[PDB]
């Protein structure tokens, strides 16, 4: 047991474990989407750069849950990364479509490690969710709602999409 | 052979020779699509500019392979430039659909032109190939290829086509 | 296929899918190793920054080969990330030295991607491999080689550890 | 016809239609001559910058016309550029000689076309020859006077050749 | 062997330590011929530092393959560095036209070690050659071409020379 | 004797050809230690930085000395230079060691070549000698005395010797 651990019950130090990797495992499909929309036969670089960002910044929520993990003297457990269901993504639409659940995914989780933080009485831990992944995650869901109205009121599809993905560019 | 002629066989120093004139076409060809699209008939400012730069990075091309011929000690000889196939070109992905075949034909005389540097021992031309033509002569059809897909979504004629162009321009 | 396609082997393609698998576990065990050396009871910062470096520019080739995945015109297939081989990675010369394996590990596997693609008369990959990844490679190796000296040198335990680490800082 | 046309004779738009042709062939005669003394064995790079720069000037040349096409709602007709006769062009001597009875052509041919001009009452074509052409060619022929001149007087042959070589450099 | 060794085959190592002391060589005749023309006797500044800079050019190109030697894992062996069979050098002509030959064979030798290189099935090496000399001693022979036929135009001997002497300078 | 010979005896004058080869001999020794303790298996920075620059100041000597030849009127002769006596240096204090007996071997014919030079009444020369060798070469012995103390009293191998040279470095 590291010299730095209190009031850190196992429970939890094992769901930062999981998080790491859900947050690892979405960061690796918004990489595959982007690549998606650099195809030539997709060309849609609004969406490229969005889910870009979106690997980027899911990839670095990981890493801050790992340094928690080294700052609370729990031991880092890195399983696998597993693929992407899925290769082609089709429409911008159909991507934002998921990405949405993904996030919500990733709420469901977050605010499930919040309350095995708080039947541990970790006030410590459930602050960590709360300035760094809860509000980041519910102003992520919140801006891809707003996307998807504007898609569909752009009309999904043709002269639309190729608008919508110059304002998003 | 002058005084500075060391390893460049006279095929290898001919098809260069052959390169400038078919390298020179190709600035022609563009140079006529690019003066089409400012026709006042067809006023398309951003397709016409792009052409240009073509017709000038594709002139460059050439006379960057003559400067390979007095340097390796070769005689340029240079050809009679052929007028392009048509004068009209009628839409702009008829233009984009036009130079993609164009900048394959291109690649493809290259590669040749590659395949026949290695096979009499001149890496000094496989060399100059590639980090010069076989770099950017990729990154072009590539190019081509984004645009003739996102000018297809955007409706490749109409209020599609419009907007496309000043996005090109 | 795709409209950019030209002289692309589907098993020079299958390679690059390959490689793109083997940077990211690389990516993901230099991941893996950045974190160990910031916990509690081995506390690094100096041998955490150098494989965080490693990590990230790890993903950064990668991303590179994503780009030319899509560049010639192939369709880039992600697998899983398998796990980092370990969880606890020893010393610090004990973390180099298996970092010094997985250095060659990818070179090695660079130098059949490049005989791959001399094979199949290619020479674009050939050179976005020698401009891009055989040299840095060979690079890569020379650093850790000589990082594993100099603290081979500065007693690989003890002071020397940490003043090496100090050093690398 | 056009929208825009006005006031447009057919044999102004023909007699374009072959100053454009006309100007590519100087345009791609001086880059004969510009290239052929960059050879190892000519190597007079103050005779090389003085033709590709006249190369560029009637290269620029060329496309005014063709422009000036597009504004009176003419059409242009690209041609083939026929290769000079020469490639081997001789003593910088010999090269400003046929130089400036190449400029002299291209001058006897505007001159000509002013004449077409005033003849089918055209005052905006008439200005285009006298304010953009003729005030240029009168003064590019007065220059290469003055050179040939200059050369005769410094020696056309060996060190006076090397000497007006650098101070036209 | 090695911490870094891969992908090395001796004959490579052994042809490096054979380049570097023909580089030590031609960096040698460099300095005999730089420092010859500024006897009081001889008294071409010009030519002076030209071989100056020459002499130091060979002589930074043989660390970079001693330096290259390093990187691989192979060992630098010295040789002993012949003196030039000359002193007296001549005409700034007939040291033109000694340079140059020694050029073609340092020339000579590096397309020589490529082929060495392309056998033992090395990319890394076959790039070196490329984009750091191949490169640089092409270069370097078209400019001797252009000078010796310079100083032949202006005159070896007499008035002629002691001008090509200061635009050298 | 050419036209600038006032007072140069021939003894004094090859004795001079002399320190060109023995000081180039110097700067190749110099440039065997700088590479072999950069070598993968030696990783000395600090070591090889020093003997690098000593080359190169060792060098410079040689070349001062070319210098006075042509001044006095003196004919170089360049000798041919001999390779080091051996590869691989043993330790940086075996290195140390090492120079220290090269540094007073010069340091001895200089004093030779100064006391060569005022018995024959070339004052000029024992100005040359002064301000230029006899100076700097005391410096320089002074200098690795100090060195060769200190890195002993560090411990010259282990850690004391990873220090010492990240403060030679
Ligand atoms: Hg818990
Ligand atoms: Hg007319
Ligand atoms: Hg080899």
Known sequence: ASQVR??????????????INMELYASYV???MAYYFERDDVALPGFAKFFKESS???REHAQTFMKYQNKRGGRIV???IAAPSMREWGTGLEALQAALDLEKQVNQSLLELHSTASGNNDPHL??????????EQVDSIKKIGDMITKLKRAGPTGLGEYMFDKELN
Chains 1, 2, 3, 4, 5, 6 share one sequence.
């Open 30 to 32: 918004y990489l595959s």
């Open 56 to 58: 980027d910044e899911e």
């Open 78 to 80: 890195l399983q696998q």
């Open 126 to 135: 459930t602050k960590l969710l709360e300035d760094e992944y809860l509000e």
């Open 6 to 19: 209190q009031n850190y019950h196992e429970d939890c130090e094992a769901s930062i474990n999981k998080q």
